[PDB]
Amino acid sequence: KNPKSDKFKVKRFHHIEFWCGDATNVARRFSWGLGMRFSAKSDLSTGNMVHASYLLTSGDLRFLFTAPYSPSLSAGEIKPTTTASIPSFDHGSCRSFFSSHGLGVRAVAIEVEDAESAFSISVANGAIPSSPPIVLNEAVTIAEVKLYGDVVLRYVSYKAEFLPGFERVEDASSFPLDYGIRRLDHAVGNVPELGPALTYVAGFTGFHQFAEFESGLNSAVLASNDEMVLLPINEPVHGTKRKSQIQTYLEHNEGAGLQHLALMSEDIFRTLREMRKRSSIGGFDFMPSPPPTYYQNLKKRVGDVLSDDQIKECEELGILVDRDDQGTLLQIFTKPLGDRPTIFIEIIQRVGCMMYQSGGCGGFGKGNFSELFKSIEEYEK
Amino acid sequence: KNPKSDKFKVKRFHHIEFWCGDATNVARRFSWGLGMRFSAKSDLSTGNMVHASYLLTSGDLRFLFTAPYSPSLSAGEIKPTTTASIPSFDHGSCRSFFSSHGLGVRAVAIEVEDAESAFSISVANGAIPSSPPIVLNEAVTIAEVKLYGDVVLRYVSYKAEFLPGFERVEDASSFPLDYGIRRLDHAVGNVPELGPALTYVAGFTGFHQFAEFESGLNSAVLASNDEMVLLPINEPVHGTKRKSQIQTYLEHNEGAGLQHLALMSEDIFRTLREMRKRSSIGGFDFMPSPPPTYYQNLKKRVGDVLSDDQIKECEELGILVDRDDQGTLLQIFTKPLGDRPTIFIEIIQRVGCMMYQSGGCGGFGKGNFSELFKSIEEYEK
Ligand SMILES: Cc1c(C(=O)C2=C(O)CCCC2=O)ccc2c1c(=O)n(CCc1ccccc1)c(=O)n2C
Ligand SMILES: Cc1c(C(=O)C2=C(O)CCCC2=O)ccc2c1c(=O)n(CCc1ccccc1)c(=O)n2C
Ligand SMILES: [Co+2]
Ligand SMILES: [Co+2]
């Protein structure tokens, strides 16, 4: 059931912003590790004396990496005279965010029709305001409300190239890397109580619960009208024999925050081959591969969607497979992106639900918890 | 003249420690960009609840990358019961260092015979103490004194594998990268006044001034007995038509600090080829290449040390060349390693002065200031 109760026109995921200590090194690491191009910059060389911001892009996926310069460089500025390209930025907020949480996502940004109305309706509907609507060069409007923890949901809207005050990057600095990633599929929060967090966010967006099909978590998924913006949220389940990875997250992150970004690939096999070649030379590591028992059991479950040759390719790459009543889902999880066991990345590709492809086709892989538990005990035998 | 006035037995450069916001991402970036192996770790998986520390090595060059975890993880610890592998670490010091300076070098570490005596003699001779001598597992002794700004000179001494509490890294995590870098040649500080900084450091080490052969700086080089530990220091020269890059550094670094690390290569041409292939895919950028006039003038100055084929290879790679009365020096400079125009890296290789090779052979390239100025105006013509 999809009641389509969005309280404002929501278009699509626009970008994800990481708050860093050093944006250059994180961005260069992510660029190599994920196959993303350097697309835009706002920094000293563009006149920004407040923050360094570098945009990576792969298809529709836009990763923004932002760190503060010394406050001394902008001491004589006030918000009306600021050189920052992102006026919601604040030296003390960013430094407090990073010291409290380590490297992680600050903003989940979605494009809307009118960021100012989306902000007014949102706060009128219970959203805790974070940064009011400001208009950039009479061209782009941007506003922020609190999402969970210190993560903001950021509304952006264009009258008609990333933001005013950003420059496109010189082609000699911009190497055309691409491992096949194309857009953001979902962004997942970890919170200590799912109920109040669900009620809050659904409260001010009008997003509806997305329908599904005992280890770790309870979760639930909020979604926009066409279900192209997907915001799952997890909470821990305490008492479990193995400690909740949601609870571990909350402890090391110092509270609620963004758990994982799921990145849709147009060819998950080439993406994984390319990322795995680079795991030990600057890129990203992947979680331990499931036992062969997991793949000996794949034929019985998805042997109608993938060939034996494509099944054995999943085993080579450690790809996990789950299925809905409408589609099948291929997925894999990186190890944590930074020092803390907090944020990590998921690579996915969906099969089915053509009408274009409808969002969430295949679900989010919750059944794979059961499949790996069974495969793990079966492999001991 | 080398009066050999070291007040304690100084062996060699041992390691350089960067204080980071996220040690994982900086270390992975530096690993790819420079060709350094993952050699040792001290982090959550080794029992360290205070900091994440990852060691990169290439030959004798040891780069250490350290960031703090949440203080909450170690709240019940006291210094006697600490799980930190580096007992001089302090959450507040590291966070203050990084917020003030951005990414940069915290510790310049040299191996000595007895770190505890080197600390006592140093402070007895004017050194501002920073962290007193502590003995690790009855095996390694380590102590720190202030060097300049917030950079400490760190003494380490072994009775007889990096430090106690570090683990060697599993070979599947440790990809054997190597672009030919082999050791640290010199580490250079920027200070607002060279005189008092020179007097201070020479004061407590006994290091002697190293003899040389109007744009930017005055500098001078302190050196240990065998001249294998080399510590140049720069100050700005104000009034210059072009602004002093030392002054720019001090402004963006919020005070004195480490300007550049010079890394000796056993084959500078292969090092540069390998680093340049990776500049735009996660590695490091290099400063703009000198004009061809600079290389048309190389034959007249060094055409007795390098072939025409090796001269044109310098032009391909943008390598600079200078010469002493005892040796010749090949060098090149990266762009800044992080967001701020502060710390950068120099790759060098020395020719001559065989006895082994004596340190500082060829000097530090000061003549190249003049050569590029002349080449720049000659190339306009
Ligand atoms: C995050 C994830 C998802 C996922 O995407 C996600 C959603 O989008 C919607 C809400 C529910 C949800 O979970 C799906 C399957 C996963 C995982 C996952 O994190 N893990 C790792 C576990 C683990 C941790 C610590 C130690 C050992 C194992 C899995 O095994 N599966 C199989
Ligand atoms: C650091 C450096 C060295 C060097 O190693 C060093 C020492 O070890 C000992 C003390 C003196 C010293 O300097 C040698 C030559 C350099 C540079 C250098 O930094 N630069 C860049 C200038 C510049 C900046 C900003 C904008 C444009 C140009 C050079 O051109 N030369 C030619
Ligand atoms: Co997911
Ligand atoms: Co130098």
Following DSSP, what letter does each residue of A214-257 receive, concatenated?
--SEEEEEEE-TTS-SEEEEEEE-TT-SSPPHHHHHHHHHTS-E
Q: Which of B311, B318, B307 is nearest to B273 (CA)?
A: B318
Q: B232 with B189: CB under 8 angstroms? A: yes
Instruction: Quote the tokens at residue B183.
Output: 């050791």
Partners of B39 on chain A (C-beta within 8 Å) are none
Contacts of B48 in chain A (CB under 8 A): none
Rounded Cα gap, residues B157 and B113, in angstroms: 6
Backbone angles phi, psi at B251, to 5 degrees: -65, -50
The residue to which tokens 């290789």 are assigned:
B349
Smallest CA-to-CA distance from B35 within B358, B275, B292 is with: B275
* Tokens 């992680």, located at residue: A104
Distance in angstroms (rounded) separating the CA atoms of residues A274 and A262 = 17
Pairing outcome for strands A104-112 and A151-158: parallel
Q: Which protein residue's CA is at the shortest distance from atom 21 of ligand 1?
A: A333
Q: Are strands B51-58 and B61-68 parallel, antiparallel or unpaired?
A: antiparallel
Q: How far apart are the first and last CA of chain A?
A: 42
How far apart are alpha carbons B368 and B322 in whole angstroms?
Answer: 6
DSSP annotation of B255: S
Q: Nearest 5 degrees, angle CA B149-CA B77-CA B135?
A: 60
Eight-class DSSP state of B360: T
Closest CA to A154 of A209, A215, A229, A97: A229
- Closest residue by Cα to atom 25, ligand 2, is B245
From B191, B287, B374, give the residue whose CB has the most ligand 2 atoms within 8 Å, as the site to mutate. Answer: B287
Rounded CA gap, B60 and B179, in Å? 13
What stretches of chain B adopt beta strand conformation (E)? 10-19, 37-42, 51-58, 61-68, 104-112, 129-136, 140-148, 151-158, 167-168, 181-190, 208-209, 217-223, 230-236, 257-265, 320-323, 327-333, 344-352
Cβ < 6 A, ligand 2 pocket: B 186, 188, 219, 232, 234, 245, 260, 333, 346, 364-366, 368-369, 372
Which are the contacts of B333, defined by CB distance < 8 A and separation ≥ 6? B260, B286, B287, B344, B345, B346
In sequence order, the 6+-apart residues with CB closer than 8 A to the CB of A73 are: A49, A50, B251, B252
Nearest CA in chain B to A53: B339
Grouping H, G, I as helix, E, B as strand and the rest as coil, residue B345 is strand
- Chain B CB contacts of A254 under 8 Å are 70, 72
Looking at the partner chain, which of B31, B67, B177 has a beta carbon nearest the beta carbon of A339?
B67
B52 exposed, middle or buried (CB, 10 Å; 0-12, 13-18, 19+)? buried
Neighbours of B277 (CB within 10 A): 11
Contacts with B99 from chain A: Cβ below 8 Å: 95, 99
Q: How far is the CA of A290 from the centre of ligand 3 (A)?
A: 17
Nearest to A252 by CA among A333, A373, A337, A368: A337
> Which residues in chain B have their CB less than 8 angstroms from residue A38's CB?
280
Give how far Cα A312 sits from Cα of A81, A267, A306, A330, Å. 59, 16, 10, 13
Annotated binding-site residue? B371: no
Q: How was this structure determined?
A: X-ray
Q: To probe the interface with A, which of B39, B254, B339 has the most A CB atoms within 10 Å?
A: B339
Residue A180, Cβ density class (10 Å: 0-12 exposed, 13-18 middle, ≥19 buried)? buried
Interface test with B, best of A18, A20, A29, A177 (most B CBs within 10 A): A29
| Alpha carbon distances (Å) from B257 to B91, B100, B148, B254, B344 | 20, 11, 6, 9, 12
Phi, psi of B285 (to 5 degrees): -95, 155
Contact between B22 and A338 using a beta-carbon 8 Å cutoff: yes
Say how far apart CA B244 and CA B374 lie, in whole Å: 19
Residues of chain B with CATH 3.10.180.10: 10-173, 181-380
Which 8-state DSSP code applies to residue B113? S
| CATH placement of domain B181-380 | 3.10.180.10
Q: For residue A145, how far is its CA from the centre of ligand 3 (angstroms)? A: 23
Burial class (CB in 10 A: 0-12, 13-18, 19+), A303: exposed
Contacts 24+ apart (CB under 8 A), B351-359: B351/B305, B351/B327, B352/B324, B352/B326, B352/B327, B352/B328, B353/B326, B353/B327, B358/B226, B358/B227, B358/B326, B359/B185, B359/B223, B359/B226, B359/B227, B359/B228, B359/B230
Given B44, B103, B173, which is nearest A25 (Cβ)? B103
Q: Known binder of ligand: residue A14?
A: no
State the pairing for strand pair A167-168/A37-42: antiparallel
Q: How is residue B188 written in tokens?
A: 């250079």
* Residue of B13, B15, B61 whose CA lies nearest to B35: B61
| Nearest CA distance, A295 vs chain B (angstrom) | 23
CA of A232 to the centre of ligand 1 (A): 12
Question: CA of A315: how far to CAs of A277, A309, A321, A368, B126, in Å?
Answer: 16, 10, 10, 15, 64
B192/B233 Cα distance (integer angstroms)? 10
CA distance B45 to chain A (A): 11
Torsion over CA: B271, B272, B277, B282 (sign): positive
Bridge partners for A157 per DSSP: A141
B8 vs B243: CA distance, rounded Å: 40
Q: State in Å: Cα A229 to ligand 3 middle.
A: 13
Q: How far is CA A201 from CA A103, A205, B201, in A?
A: 24, 6, 59
CATH placement of domain B10-173: 3.10.180.10
* Ligand 1 pocket at CB < 6 A: A 186, 188, 219, 232, 234, 245, 260, 333, 346, 364-366, 368-369, 372
Taking CA–CA distances from A285, the nearest residue in chain B reads B173
SS3 state at A275: helix
Query: Residue B3 and residue B6: Cα distance in Å, rounded?
Result: 9
Sheet containing A104-112: order of strands? A129-136, A140-148, A151-158, A104-112, A10-19, A61-68, A51-58, A37-42, A167-168
Cα-to-centroid distance, A251 and ligand 1 (Å): 18
CB pairs under 8 A between A and B: 124
Mutation target to probe the B interface, by most B beta carbons within 10 A, among A32, A339, A344 is: A339
Measured from the CA of A220, which atom of ligand 1 is nearest?
10
Query: How many whole angstroms separate alpha carbon B16 and alpha carbon B110?
Result: 9
Cβ burial of B71 (10 Å; 0-12, 13-18, 19+) is middle
Q: What are phi and psi of B239, to 5 degrees?
A: 90, -25
* Separation between Cα atoms, residue B173 and residue B223, nearest integer Å: 37
Tokens matching residue A361: 């086709």
A208-209 vs A181-190, strand pairing mode: unpaired
Distance of CA B246 to the CA centre of its chain: 17
> Of how many residues is chain B composed?
381
What are the strands, taking DSSP E only, across chain A?
A: 10-19, 37-42, 51-58, 61-68, 104-112, 129-136, 140-148, 151-158, 167-168, 181-190, 208-209, 217-223, 230-236, 257-265, 320-323, 327-333, 344-352
Please list, residue by residue across B149-176, b when 16 or more beta carbons sit within 10 angstroms of its beta carbon and e when fewer do: bbbbbbbbbbeeebbebbeeeeeeebbe
Do A153 and A224 meet the contact criterion of CB atoms below 8 Å apart?
no
Tokens of A83: 């050189």
To 10 degrees, what angle do helices A91-101 and B91-101 make?
Answer: 140
Which SS3 state, helix, strand or coil, does residue A92 take? helix
Strands B181-190 and B208-209: unpaired
Find, among B322, B344, B324, B326, the residue nearest to B335 by Cα.
B344
Q: Residue B258: what are its φ and ψ, rounded to 5°?
A: -80, 125
How far is Cα B250 from Cα B341, in angstroms, rounded to an integer? Answer: 10
d(CA B330, CA B361): 11
User: How many CB atoms are located within 10 Å of the residue A54 CB?
Assistant: 26
A336's CB contacts (< 8 A; 6+ apart) are: A342, A343, A344
Distance (Å, whole) CA A238 – CA A242: 9
Contact across the interface for B25 and A25, Cβ inside 8 Å: yes
Strand segments, DSSP code E, in B204-253 are 208-209, 217-223, 230-236
Q: Of B69, B283, B339, which is closest to A340 when you measure between CB atoms?
A: B69
DSSP summary character for residue B286: B
**Do residues A138 and A376 lie in contact, with contact meaning Cβ atoms separated by under 8 Å?**
no
Render A354-378 in DSSP notation, one character per residue.
B--B-TTTT-S-THHHHHHHHHHHH
Q: How far apart are CA B232 and CA A292, in angstroms?
A: 58
Cβ(A342)–Cβ(A336) below 8 Å: yes
> How many Å lie between the centroid of ligand 1 and the Cα of residue B82?
33
Dist. CA A162–CA A60, nearest whole Å: 12
Single-letter code of the amino acid located at B21 = G
Q: How far is the CA of A366 from the centre of ligand 1 (A)?
A: 7
Pocket test for ligand 2, best of B249, B366, B372 (most atoms within 8 A of CB): B366
Residues 6+ apart with CB under 8 A from A370: none
* Residue B69 Cα distances to A102, B49, B83, B142, angstroms: 8, 7, 12, 22
Q: How far apart are CA A303 and CA B118, in angstroms?
A: 70
Q: Cβ atoms within 10 A of the Cβ of B1, count?
A: 6
Q: Tell me how many degrees the CA angle B110-B111-B116 measures, rounded to the nearest 5.
A: 100
Half-sphere exposure of A69 (CA within 13 A, CB side): 24
Type and span of the H or E element at B372 = helix B367-380
For tokens 């192209």, what's the residue?
A: A228
- Yes or no, beta carbons of B98 and A52 under 8 Å apart: no
Q: Do A22 and B23 touch (CB under 8 A)?
A: no
CB contact under 8 A, A28 and B29: yes
- Nearest protein CA to atom 27 of ligand 1, as residue: A245
Q: Which residues pair with A96 in a beta bridge?
A: none
Resolution (A): 1.8
Task: Give the Å distances, CA to CA, from A329 to A201, A268, A359.
Answer: 26, 11, 12
Q: Is A118 helix (H, G, I), strand (E, B) or coil?
A: helix
CA distance A104 to B70: 14
